[PDB]
């Protein structure tokens, strides 16, 4: 309950959703993902990350995670309200009681 996301492409543009804690699973499989898209363009298994108080790290993806355009090495801690992408998965994370930007920048 620490985090929430938001998504700026495809089906669920808009939409905030809370980050459980713990490993948290983005994907088009709901048998293997917490956080289920729709989008053809997602994996089964799209993005792995893990979620605590202190912040969020990439622990997986089905292609690089990009911030801000660099490639993210696993295990690192992301930066909050930055552009993160993971192919046709265009999204960024704030603390819950913050703003989310109406529109992300997509770098290059």
Same mark, same amino acid.
């Given at each position: 309950g620490s985090w929430v996301c938001r998504f700026y492409q495809g089906?669920?543009?808009? %939409?905030? %959703?809370? =980050? $459980?804690?713990?490993r948290c699973v983005f994907g088009s499989d709901p048998l293997q993902? /917490?956080?289920v898209l729709s989008d053809s363009e997602i994996a089964p298994v799209h993005l792995v990350l893990m979620v605590d108080e202190e912040g969020i790290r990439l622990t /997986?993806?089905?292609? $690089? =995670? =990009?911030?801000e355009g660099l490639p993210v090495p696993l295990g690192t801690l992301l930066r909050a309200g930055s552009c993160l992408e993971v192919g046709f998965l265009l999204w960024t994370f704030v603390a819950v009681g913050q703003p989310l930007p109406e529109t992300l920048q997509v770098p290059t």
């Open positions: 089906k669920h543009r808009g %939409v905030e %959703v809370e =980050l $459980p804690h713990g993902s /917490d956080i /997986d993806s089905a292609e $690089p =995670l =990009l911030q």
